[PDB]
Paper text:
During the first 3 years of the pandemic, the spike (S) protein on the virus surface has been actively undergoing antigenic drift generating a large number of variants. Being a highly dynamic protein, SARS-CoV-2 S-protein has been observed to adopt RBD “up” and “down” conformations. Our structural study reveals that interactions between the VL6-57-encoded mAbs and RBD are mainly mediated by germline gene encoded residues in HCDR3 and LCDR1, while germline gene encoded LCDR3 residues support HCDR3 in antigen binding. We provide evidence to suggest that the identified class of antibodies constitute a potential immune pressure driving the genesis of S371L/F-S373P-S375F mutations in Omicron variants.
Notably, H18 exhibits detectable cross-reactivities with RBDs of SARS-CoV-1, Bat CoV RaTG13, and Pangolin CoV GD1, with affinities ranging between 134–332 nM. H18 has mild neutralization activity towards wildtype, Alpha, Beta and Delta SARS-CoV-2 authentic viruses, it also possesses activity to trigger conformational change of SARS-CoV-2 S and exhibits inhibition activity in the S-protein-ACE2 interaction mediated cell-cell membrane fusion assay. When paired with other RBD-specific antibodies, binding of antibodies to cryptic epitopes may also result in spike inactivation by promoting S-trimer disassembly. Similar S-trimer disassembly has been observed previously in the presence of mAb-R1-3216,56. Consistent with our expectation, the R104 residue within the “WLRG” motif is interacting with Y94 within the LCDR3 “QSYDSS” motif via a cation-π interaction.
Residue numbers in the entry:
A (entry chain L): 1 to 110, 119 to 220
B (entry chain E): 2 to 214
C (entry chain C): 33 to 70, 78 to 617, 633 to 676
D (entry chain H): 1 to 224
E (entry chain D): 2 to 228
Amino acid sequence: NFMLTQPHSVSESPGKTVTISCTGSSGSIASNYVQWYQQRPGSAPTTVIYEDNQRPSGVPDRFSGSIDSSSNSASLTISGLKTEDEADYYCQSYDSSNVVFGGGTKLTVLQPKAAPSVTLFPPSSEELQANKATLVCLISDFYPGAVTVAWKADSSPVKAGVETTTPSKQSNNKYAASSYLSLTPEQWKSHRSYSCQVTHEGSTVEKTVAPT
Amino acid sequence: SVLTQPPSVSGAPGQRVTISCTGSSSNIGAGYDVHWYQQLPGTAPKLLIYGNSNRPSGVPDRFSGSKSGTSASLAITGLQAEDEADYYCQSYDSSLSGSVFGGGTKLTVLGQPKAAPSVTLFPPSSEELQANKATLVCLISDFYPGAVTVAWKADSSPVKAGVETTTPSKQSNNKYAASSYLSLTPEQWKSHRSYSCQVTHEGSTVEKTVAPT
Amino acid sequence: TRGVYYPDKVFRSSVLHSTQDLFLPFFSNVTWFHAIHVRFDNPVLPFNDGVYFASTEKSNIIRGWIFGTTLDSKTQSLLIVNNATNVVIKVCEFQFCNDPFLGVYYHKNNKSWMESEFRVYSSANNCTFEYVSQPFLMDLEGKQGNFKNLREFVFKNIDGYFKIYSKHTPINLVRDLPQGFSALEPLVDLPIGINITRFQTLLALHRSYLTPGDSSSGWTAGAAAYYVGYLQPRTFLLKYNENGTITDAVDCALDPLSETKCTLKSFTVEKGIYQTSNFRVQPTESIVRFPNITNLCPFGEVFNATRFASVYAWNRKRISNCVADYSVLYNSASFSTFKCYGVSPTKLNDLCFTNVYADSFVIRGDEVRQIAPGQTGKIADYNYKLPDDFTGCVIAWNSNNLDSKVGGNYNYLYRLFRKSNLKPFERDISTEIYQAGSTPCNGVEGFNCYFPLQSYGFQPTNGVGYQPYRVVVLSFELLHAPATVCGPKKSTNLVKNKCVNFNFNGLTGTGVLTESNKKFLPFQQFGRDIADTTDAVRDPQTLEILDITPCSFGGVSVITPGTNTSNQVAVLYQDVNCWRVYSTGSNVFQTRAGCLIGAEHVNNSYECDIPIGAGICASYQT
Amino acid sequence: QVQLQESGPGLVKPSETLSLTCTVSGGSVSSGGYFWSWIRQPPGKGLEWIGCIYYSGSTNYNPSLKSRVTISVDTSKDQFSLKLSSVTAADTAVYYCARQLWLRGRFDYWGQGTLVTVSSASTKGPSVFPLAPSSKSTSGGTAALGCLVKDYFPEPVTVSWNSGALTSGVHTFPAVLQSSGLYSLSSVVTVPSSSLGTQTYICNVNHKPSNTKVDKKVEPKSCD
Amino acid sequence: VQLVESGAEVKKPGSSVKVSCKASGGTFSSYAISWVRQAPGQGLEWMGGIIPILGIANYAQKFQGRVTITADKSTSTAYMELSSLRSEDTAVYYCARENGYSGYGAAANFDLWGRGTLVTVSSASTKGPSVFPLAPSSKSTSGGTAALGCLVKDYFPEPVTVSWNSGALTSGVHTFPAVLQSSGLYSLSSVVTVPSSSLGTQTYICNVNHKPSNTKVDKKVEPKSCD
Ligand SMILES: *[C@@H]1O[C@H](CO)[C@@H](O)[C@H](O)[C@H]1NC(C)=O
C-alpha cells in the first residue's frame, strides 16, 4: 500500500529555482529508485531523471534530483525555468513487484479583458422536419476563458436540454465557447421568443431569436 | 575444516623454519586475520600470535608471523628442545559461520645414537593355564619406536591373529620401551613345539626360541 | 554523392547526426558493365559487405538478382525474380544453371511481347521463405530512344536481416552515370537469415524473326547497362531536412578537405587552421575479448545461506575466478531493497572488477534504510559504515519465515555504544563494557556501565518497520591488477595490423593491434605512455601483450581558404620532414613547422593572411 | 534504433474485452532481456501502471487491476498484446507500451499514445443542420454563421468550410456529451455582412467511423 | 586469570555427559566463552560459544541438534551438555575465552584455555582386574641381573598406577602403556632389573590400587623351581 504524494500545481516565474517533492507514505523512498518523467501535452512521456541523480543523455543540466530518506520525500530541483518546461512531471518507484507512479505535477512557466462576442441561431427548417430542434448559442473572442451561459424561455430560466462547451483558447489569444439548447418542435413554437444570455466579468451580453 | 597444513615439518636448532597455512577465499582470502596456537605434548594450547603482527605477554620474541594473500606464514628463529609442539592456524570462516582450525603441523627436532634392539621372551607361567587363556608377551627394550616389527611364528606357519603394536614410552635415560601381547588358548599351547618373537629394526633381526616343554 | 540512405528510422529535423554504417565511398571506382547488341556480361560478384546496384533502363531489361553461397543446391540461397506477372522471392536450395536468363519472344504477325522462357533454376528441394506480390501488367516493349529510367538498389546483410533501399529517378544521360544527390528509403525487410558471399545478375533475353539460329545463338541483347559498387563501412555526415528527406551528405574519409566538415559538423568550412586526424582508415570489424573462465560464481551460497551472521560480526566472502551473472539478482521481485551507487545496472555485464566482496547480516527495516554511504545512527555509525566512494551496493529482502520464530529470536546482536566513530569497511568485535561516567568500569555491570551488544527482538507480530531483513552487501574494487571476475559477455577472435575497434576487459577504444616485445610484470595489466593513453593489452585469453597503435598518429594542418571562395586546400604535416601522408601530390615545400603540400612557395614576402607557423604565411593568389 | 507502435481499435463497448497490440520495430523482444510493460493515462489524470511482461511467461499485475489483465508475447510476430476484461466507463485512458531496460529502472522508450473511448450505444452517423444568419446574428459590420453537428458517435468529426478554402475566423468547438450520451459540436466562421447574399458558404462534415460525408449549404434565414 | 574444569569422565555410547568450566582467581565478565575439542591425533575443532552477559549460545554448523551449551552469570560458570555420544566422540574438551579486537580482519582469538576434560566411551562395564606373577627362567638369567615383574589383565580404565613395594623401589622401574584390543580390553606390563643375589633373601610384591573399582590386592612373586 505504497503510494507517492505529489503537489498538484506548482508555479514559478522563468529563470528562478523551484523544488518538486515526491513523498512516499508507507515504504521508504530510499528502498527503491525514483524516476522523473516529463510529459508534454499530446505527447508520450520522456525520462528526464533516472537512478535518482543520473541525468540521461539529452536532458539539460538543470534537471537535478535529490533524495531525502528522513522525510521519505524525493526532490526534483529545476533552475532557470524556460518556455518548453511547461509539462507534467511524475515520479516513479518500484515498491515490490508493482510499479507505483506519482500524483502528477504541473510545472507552470508563469490584464485587458476581451469583449464576449455572442451570436445565437434558431433551429433550422431541415431540423424541424426531422422532428428535432436545437438552439445554438456561440461565444467567441473573450478573455478570461470563464463564462456562464443561461438560456431563457418566454419568462423562465431554461436548464433542461442545455449542453455547453468549455471555453477553449483561440488563435488570437482569446477564448471561444458554445451552448446548445435541445428542444422539441412544439417547445420552440410554444414560446414567443428564446434568448441566450452570456455573463462575462459581471457584464451580460444577450441575443434572442423568435420563430419567423 | 579446509585449513590444510603440511602433516609434519623438520628443522634444526640454529636454522629458521617457515610454516605455511593456506585456506581458501572464504576464510583466508576474505581478509580475516589468522591466529596461531602452540600445543605442547601434554599441555593445553595457548595463544601465540594474534592479529598477524602482535604478540601477547609471556611469549618469546623469536616467534614471528605474517599474512599476505590467501596464505599465512610463521617464522621461528630459535628451535630449542622445548620447541617440539603442535602448531595450529585459526581464522574466521564465513561459509561455516564460525571459527575454523588448521590441521596442525608436527615439528620434531631430536637426535640420539641409536643402537641394536634387545628383545626378551617371557613364556606364560603355570598359573595362567587355568584361566582358559594364553598371554604370550614379547618385551622389547633399548630400541627405537621408528622401526617396530612384531611377527609371531610357530616354526611352521606365521601367526596373523592376536598381533598388535604398542606405542613405546620414554624412559628415564632417553630410551623407549614397549611390549606386545598375543592372545591364544591353553588347548593349543601344548600342541605346538615352540613359539618365538621376531623384531626387525633397520635390517637387524634377532630371534630367540623358548621351550615350553 | 550517391547511395546515401536512411540508417535509422528515427525522425530528425534541423539536426546533424554522425552515423557509422556501411555507406558508399565518394567517387569510388565502380565497375562498369555494358550490354550492346551493336556483350551479354552476367558475371558473379563477391558479396563482402554490400552491393550497390546502379542501373539505367529504357526497355525493362534487368529483372532480379540471385543471392547465395555456392549456388549449386548445397547451401541455402535466395531468389529475387520479377517476371511479367508478379514478383517472386524464395529461399530454397536452387540448382542454378551456368548462364541463367529470362527469354521474351516477339511475333511478326502482331506487335506484342510475351515471356515464354523461364531458365533460372533446375529444381528446389527445401524451401523456408516464400513471398508473392500482387499481379501486374508489364510493358516489356523496346525503345529506340535513349535511356529514361534510372534504378538504384542497396543490399545489406546484417544479423541475417536483408534491407533493400531503392529510389526511381528519371534521367536523360546517354552512357555516363548521372551526377547529383538522391535519397533512398526502405520498402521491406526480409529476415532471410542465410550467409551470402556472392551474387549474379539476371538479365532479359529477346527473340524475334530477326535472329535466326538455335536457342543458344538465335537471340539478341537489349541496350542496357548497370554498375556494381561496394559498401565499405565509413563514417558520414547526413543533413536531414525539415521534410525528413536527406538532401546532401558529407564524407569523413574521402579527402582532407572533406574531413574538416566532419570535425566541424557543418557543410561550410571557414578560413583557419583545423586538425582532423592523420592518415585515417575507417574501422571494419569490432572485437571483444573476455577471460575464458566458464565457471559459475558462488552467488547462491551468499543469498541462500542457512544462517546469517550478526550485525557486529558480519561475514565476508570473496568471489573470483568466475563469470558474474547479475541477471539473477537485479531481475527478481524478492529483493525488497536493491539500490546501487555508481554500479550502473544493465552495464555490470560489461565492466570488470578486481574482486567481489559479499557481506551477510540481518538488520531491521528502519536500519536497512541507513546503509546509504552518507548517514548516521546506531548502525551506520557504530556497526557498519560505508565509505562515500563505495563501489558496489547492498541487496536486502524480507525474512520472517526464517530468522524469526515465536517466543522471541534473540540470536542476533548489534552494537549500541561506542567511544568513537567506526571507520569504513571496518568490523569490530569488542565485548568490553562501555563506560559513560568517570567511575571505573573494570568488568562491572553496575551504574553507568552497559553492555555494548544489545539483543534483537524479532517477534513475528512486530510492525513492518521492526521486521528482520536479510541484508547482503556486494562490494567491488578497482585495482591495478588482472581482472579475475567479469561479466558473461562472449569473446571473439583476434586480428592484427588492422584498424579495429577493441573491447578488452571492459575497456573500449579504436586502434591498431600489433605485436610488442615489452615484458610485463605479473600483477600489472594495463600500461600507459607519457600522454596517459592506453598502449598495451594483457589479453588474458592468450596471455600475450599486444601493442596498441593509434589509427591516426601524426599532426595534420589543413589550410582551407574557405568553402565558397575556393575548393583547393593545402595540407601541412607537422611531424613529417620532407611517406605516411594522404597524397604526395605536387608543390611539396618543407618548412620549420613541418612539410606543406598542395601550396606553391614563392620567393617574395607579402603580408601574412593565413599564418602557418615559424614565420610561414600563405594566401590565395592568381 | 528501436521504436514501438500500437494497434487495436480506438473503441470498446462496456462489459467487453479489450484488444491492444504493441508492435516492436527495429529490435527483438526475446533478445536483450528487456521487460515490456503497459502504462495507461486518463485525460487530465496521472499515469497508471497496469502490468509488465518478460520475454518468458513471467507476469506481474497491479493489485487494483488484478484478475482482469491478460498479456501474452508472440515472438514469431515480434509483438505483444494485452487483454482487458470487464472494461467500464472509468477505463477511458491513453494506453502506452514501453520497453523497460531494467526491472526497477526507467521506461526508456515510450510508444505513441492510442486513444481508447469506452462508451455505450453504438456507432451512428451525424445529423447536420445549418445555422442561418439574420439581423440578430450580426453585431456591427460583421456577421456569423456555422453548421450544427448533432447526435453522432464516436469521436472524431472533421468540419471544413468550402473544402478548406475558408480558414480565417473558423472556430471548431470541442465536442461535449449530450443528455443521451451523444457527442455534439458546431464549427462556425465570422464573415462581413456585405457578402451574405452574394457569397456561398458550404460546410463539409466528415465522420470516418460511420463512413459519412455531408455537405450543407448555409443561407440566410427565410422568414415564413 | 585461571580456568578450571572437572576431572576425567567415562560414559556410554549413547548416553549424556555434563562438564563445567569454573573460573578461579577472577571472573570472565563481558568476555565470550567458547569450547574447543580435540580428537587424539586430529586437529582442534570449534563447536560453540557463549556471551555470558546476555546468555546466548551460538553453535557451529557441523552439529547443532545434539549439543546444548549453557552458562550462568551469577556463579560465573559455563556448563557443557552433550547427547547421543558415539565412539568417535572420544576426545578432550577445553573452555576457551574469546578476546576480540577492532581491525580489518577481526577474527576471534582464544587467549586463555582450560585444563581439559577427558570424555571417553566404553561399552564394556567395569570388571575386576587380574594380576599374574612373572619370573625369569634359568636360561634368562645368564649374568648378575634378572628381569621380573607383574602383569595385570582385564583392567579398566587406563589410569591404574603400579607401585613396587609400596614405593620403596625407585631405580630400574618402568611403566608400559596398554594397547587397544579387538574386545576393547586394556593390558599393561611392568618389568624391573634386580641382582640375582637378592632373589633368595628378600621378596618382590606388586601393589595395585584401583580407585574406581574400590579394590587393592596383594600378590607374591617367586622364582620358578623347574628352571
Ligand atoms: C535461492 O533459492 C531460491 C529457491 O530455490 C531461488 O529461487 C533463488 O534464485 C536462489 N538465490 C539465488 C541467488 O540463486
